[PDB]
Amino acid sequence: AFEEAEKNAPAIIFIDELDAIAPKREKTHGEVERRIVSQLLTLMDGLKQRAHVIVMAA
Amino acid sequence: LSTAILKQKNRPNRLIVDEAINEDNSVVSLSQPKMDELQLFRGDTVLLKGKKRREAVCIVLSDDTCSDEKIRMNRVVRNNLRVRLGDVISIQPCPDVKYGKRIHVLPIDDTVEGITGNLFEVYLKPYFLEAYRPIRKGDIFLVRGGMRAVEFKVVETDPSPYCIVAPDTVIHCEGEPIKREDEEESLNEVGYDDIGGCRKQLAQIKEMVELPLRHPALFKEIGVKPPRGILLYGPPGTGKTLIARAVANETGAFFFLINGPEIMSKLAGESESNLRKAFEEAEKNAPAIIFIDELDAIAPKREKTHGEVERRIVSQLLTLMDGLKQRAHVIVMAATNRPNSIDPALRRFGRFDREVDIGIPDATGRLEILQIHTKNMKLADDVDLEQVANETHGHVGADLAALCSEAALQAIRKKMDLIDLEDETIDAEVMNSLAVTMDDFRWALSQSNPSALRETVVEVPQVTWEDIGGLEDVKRELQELVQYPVEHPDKFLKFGMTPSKGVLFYGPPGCGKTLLAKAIANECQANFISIKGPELLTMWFGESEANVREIFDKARQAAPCVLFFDQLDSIAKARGGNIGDGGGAADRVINQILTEMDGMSTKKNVFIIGATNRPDIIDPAILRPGRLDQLIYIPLPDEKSRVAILKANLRKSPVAKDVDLEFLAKMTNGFSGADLTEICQRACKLAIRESIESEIRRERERQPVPEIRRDHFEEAMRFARRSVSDNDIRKYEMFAQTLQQSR
Ligand SMILES: Nc1ncnc2c1ncn2[C@@H]1O[C@H](COP(=O)(O)OP(=O)(O)OP(=O)(O)O)[C@@H](O)[C@H]1O
Ligand SMILES: Nc1ncnc2c1ncn2[C@@H]1O[C@H](COP(=O)(O)OP(=O)(O)OP(=O)(O)O)[C@@H](O)[C@H]1O
Ligand SMILES: [Mg+2]
Ligand SMILES: [Mg+2]
Numbered sequence: 195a196f197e198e199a200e201k202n203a204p205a206i207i208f209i210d211e212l213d214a215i216a217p218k219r220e221k222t223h224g225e226v227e228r229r230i231v232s233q234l235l236t237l238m239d240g241l242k243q244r245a246h247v248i249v250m251a252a
Numbered sequence: 253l254s255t256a257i258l259k260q261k262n263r264p265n266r267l268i269v270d271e272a273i274n275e276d277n278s279v280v281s282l283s284q285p286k287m288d289e290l291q292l293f294r295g296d297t298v299l300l301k302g303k304k305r306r307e308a309v310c311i312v313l314s315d316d317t318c319s320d321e322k323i324r325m326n327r328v329v330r331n332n333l334r335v336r337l338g339d340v341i342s343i344q345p346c347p348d349v350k351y352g353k354r355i356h357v358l359p360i361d362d363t364v365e366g367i368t369g370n371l372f373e374v375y376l377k378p379y380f381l382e383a384y385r386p387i388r389k390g391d392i393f394l395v396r397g398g399m400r401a402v403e404f405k406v407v408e409t410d411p412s413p414y415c416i417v418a419p420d421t422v423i424h425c426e427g428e429p430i431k432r433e434d435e436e437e438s439l440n441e442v443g444y445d446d447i448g449g450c451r452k453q454l455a456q457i458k459e460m461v462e463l464p465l466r467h468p469a470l471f472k473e474i475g476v477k478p479p480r481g482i483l484l485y486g487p488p489g490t491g492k493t494l495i496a497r498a499v500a501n502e503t504g505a506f507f508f509l510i511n512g513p514e515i516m517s518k519l520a521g522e523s524e525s526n527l528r529k530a531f532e533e534a535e536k537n538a539p540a541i542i543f544i545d546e547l548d549a550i551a552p553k554r555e556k557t558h559g560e561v562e563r564r565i566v567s568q569l570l571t572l573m574d575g576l577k578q579r580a581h582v583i584v585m586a587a588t589n590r591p592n593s594i595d596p597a598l599r600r601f602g603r604f605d606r607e608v609d610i611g612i613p614d615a616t617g618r619l620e621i622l623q624i625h626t627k628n629m630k631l632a633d634d635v636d637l638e639q640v641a642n643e644t645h646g647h648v649g650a651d652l653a654a655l656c657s658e659a660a661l662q663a664i665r666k667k668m669d670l671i672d673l674e675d676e677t678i679d680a681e682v683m684n685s686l687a688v689t690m691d692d693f694r695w696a697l698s699q700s701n702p703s704a705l706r707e708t709v710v711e712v713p714q715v716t717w718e719d720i721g722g723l724e725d726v727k728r729e730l731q732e733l734v735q736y737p738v739e740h741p742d743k744f745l746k747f748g749m750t751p752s753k754g755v756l757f758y759g760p761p762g763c764g765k766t767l768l769a770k771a772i773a774n775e776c777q778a779n780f781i782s783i784k785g786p787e788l789l790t791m792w793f794g795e796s797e798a799n800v801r802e803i804f805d806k807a808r809q810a811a812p813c814v815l816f817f818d819q820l821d822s823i824a825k826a827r828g829g830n831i832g833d834g835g836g837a838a839d840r841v842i843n844q845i846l847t848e849m850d851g852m853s854t855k856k857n858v859f860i861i862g863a864t865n866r867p868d869i870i871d872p873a874i875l876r877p878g879r880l881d882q883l884i885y886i887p888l889p890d891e892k893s894r895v896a897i898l899k900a901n902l903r904k905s906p907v908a909k910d911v912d913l914e915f916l917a918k919m920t921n922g923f924s925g926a927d928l929t930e931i932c933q934r935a936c937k938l939a940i941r942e943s944i945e946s947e948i949r950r951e952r953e954r955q956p957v958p959e960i961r962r963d964h965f966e967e968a969m970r971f972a973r974r975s976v977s978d979n980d981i982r983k984y985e986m987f988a989q990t991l992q993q994s995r
Contacts, residue, residue, distance in 0.1 A: 211597075214554075221555075223558040224558075225560075226560055
């Protein structure tokens with residue numbers, strides 16, 4: 195999702211049901227949820243404002 | 253118009269089932285005027301629809317003896333239609349029925365036994381010789397002749413399913429005979445008419461599941477999207493799975509059943525793949541219905557879940573129910589008795605958006621359920637299902653089935669004298685005499701109890717109102733407070749006053765509070781829940797509140813129910829008095845109790861009775877209006893009440909005539925009911941000691957005491973003591989004065 199997001203300069207990402215893939219790490223009982231949250235964090239940080247990719251969440 | 257879809261409109265095809273005088277299996281008779289109204293000729297083939305999606309084909313005949321509103325059938329085609337006498341069926345002209353190219357039949361296994369010759373040559377061939385009979389696939393027909401008449405099932409038809417058996421048509425009975433049990437199970441199939449007390453719920457279900465699948469064009473044109481997710485929720489045994497079976501049997505749409513825990517599989521990724529396969533197979537065969545029984549098994553809240561596979565399954569269910577909109581005609585219906593345990597996101601818009609509450613039936617609904625369950629039994633004439641419906645205050649439909657089963661089992665027990673279990677066979681006369689009577693149903697009602705109140709049930713002594721002496725005003729007030737709200741709510745609504753739903757008993761120890769509770773349990777026709785004070789408290793945090801919630805919920809489920817709190821001050825003590833000492837769980841318990849007392853609507857008839865001999869330490873909030881409104885002072889008995897108590901205790905005892913109870917009442921001024929009972933018990937023990945010593949003396953001389961006497965009571969009275977002091981009485985007097993001042 196993120197990669198074919200940066201591939202197109204005006205591309206946009208929308209994450210519906212953010213709480214599903216991004217629960218609070220303080221209260222969570224699974225390794226995979228924490229991994230996916232941190233992976234989303236790394237994907238967000240990888241953006242250098244040159245890709246011009248806008249990510250909304252609901 | 254809520255249940256308009258249940259009632260069937262009067263149509264020319266709609267006709268009452270009637271007995272046929274002379275019609276054979278392949279023909280039926282209708283009245284000539286009604287026949288002309290239907291534009292039907294003699295000798296025309298006719299297609300009969302029936303319950304549980306079963307149809308038959310016959311030949312319409314004109315009979316003047318037949319009624320116009322009635323269509324005449326023999327029992328064979330009635331069994332082919334799964335119908336009985338008094339039912340309404342629709343008859344239509346079956347078009348382009350063709351002579352059968354070949355038809356394959358299978359006889360029933362029981363009938364073939366004892367028939368040495370060929371079934372075809374003896375029965376089938378003369379039956380179909382120049383018959384030109386119309387038949388359908390799956391029909392069962394009986395042919396007379398030989399040693400025994402033989403039944404047959406037309407398994408295969410060509411052309412299918414309707415075909416005319418011309419002489420050139422080849423009918424053959426080779427193959428495996430059909431078991432009688434299979435035909436019995438097919439005939440005894442669950443339908444919409446096997447459900448009782450859920451007319452409104454059946455209306456909602458038919459409006460949501462049957463109408464969109466039959467007629468989706470109407471929903472498209474009116475502008476709405478038909479509901480996709482339907483969730484049946486209710487107490488156990490209320491009939492959710494019964495409704496699912498009825499829908500599965502009586503719906504033409506493809507039915508897919510998902511048992512919850514069956515989703516799980518050992519292989520990684522196989523469970524959500526099983527869910528995906530279920531939804532894909534529903535899409536392949538559309539219109540489709542997916543029934544998920546025990547939805548809470550695979551769909552708990554993801555936040556509370558500690559397993560990754562369970563959370564992935566909940567997410568897969570969310571995704572599939574979201575994509576259900578793309579699916580053309582798949583409808584997902586789920587059943588659960590723990591609707592609160594379901595993941596909340598699954599109850600949102602677009603997924604399980606419709607919820608049907610299969611609740612506890614009322615008196616008329618219980619009568620319908622009893623009529624449904626007793627239709628096959630051999631009831632006697634004296635039976636009265638109306639009384640049985642009125643007695644079962646908390647039964648849900650599984651309890652009524654249990655009641656019918658127990659009544660029939662008692663009926664069978666009454667013949668265990670005539671038939672021994674070790675006997676190899678039974679005389680036919682014993683079967684002929686066997687029948688269920690009203691006495692058996694009354695025995696069942698005596699044993700019957702709601703399934704919900706199976707953990708709170710306690711053995712209560714058989715205390716009767718005549719066992720209690722005095723307290724006549726209290727007895728009358730309690731009887732009215734129990735009977736009036738349940739019997740005549742309309743008057744209370746008319747005058748605008750809600751009936752009091754809370755009673756507290758306060759008084760000296762031993763004055764008759766728990767005895768009154770026992771009398772209420774034995775005599776009143778209301779379910780009784782008696783709980784000890786500290787029964788609910790649990791060390792684990794959050795469990796005591798859950799216990800209060802469970803007890804109040806199962807009180808509501810059994811309404812009209814009486815919820816008795818013996819030693820209420822343990823359950824409800826003054827807040828802040830012991831707040832500093834302890835964790836604070838008792839305050840949470842009392843707050844939960846207050847919430848439950850406030851939460852009850854008046855429509856549920858849950859009477860709450862509290863008993864305590866320490867009203868001064870009852871929490872003041874409990875006595876506030878709306879919760880435990882009526883406060884009753886069970887006082888220390890007076891002279892007339894003491895005479896009544898002494899008579900009630902000695903009612904079943906042999907007491908000498910010269911024993912004067914009036915003087916005993918006079919001398920025991922400050923005594924309570926427990927004190928008088930102790931006096932009588934002491935007199936009884938003295939009499940028993942005298943009798944035992946007399947028997948010992950007679951045995952000694954070899955190697956009396958017909959009743960209690962005046963000397964026994966005289967000896968017992970010197971041991972007697974007044975249990976309640978004057979200061980104790982003054983305590984309740986001050987409580988009453990303060991309470992009156994507050995009010
Ligand atoms: N309204 C009713 N009319 C007729 N029979 C009923 C009705 N409700 C229940 N029954 C009978 O009682 C039993 C109900 O069992 P069922 O599986 O339908 O209940 P349920 O609601 O699914 O319960 P649970 O929550 O424990 O799964 C069946 O034997 C059924 O014949
Ligand atoms: N009015 C009465 N008629 C007959 N027996 C009575 C009466 N009042 C009390 N008794 C008898 O005296 C005893 C009193 O017990 P009971 O359960 O009625 O007391 P209680 O009022 O609930 O008191 P406690 O506060 O000690 O629990 C029992 O043995 C009961 O049978
Ligand atoms: Mg069930
Ligand atoms: Mg008591």
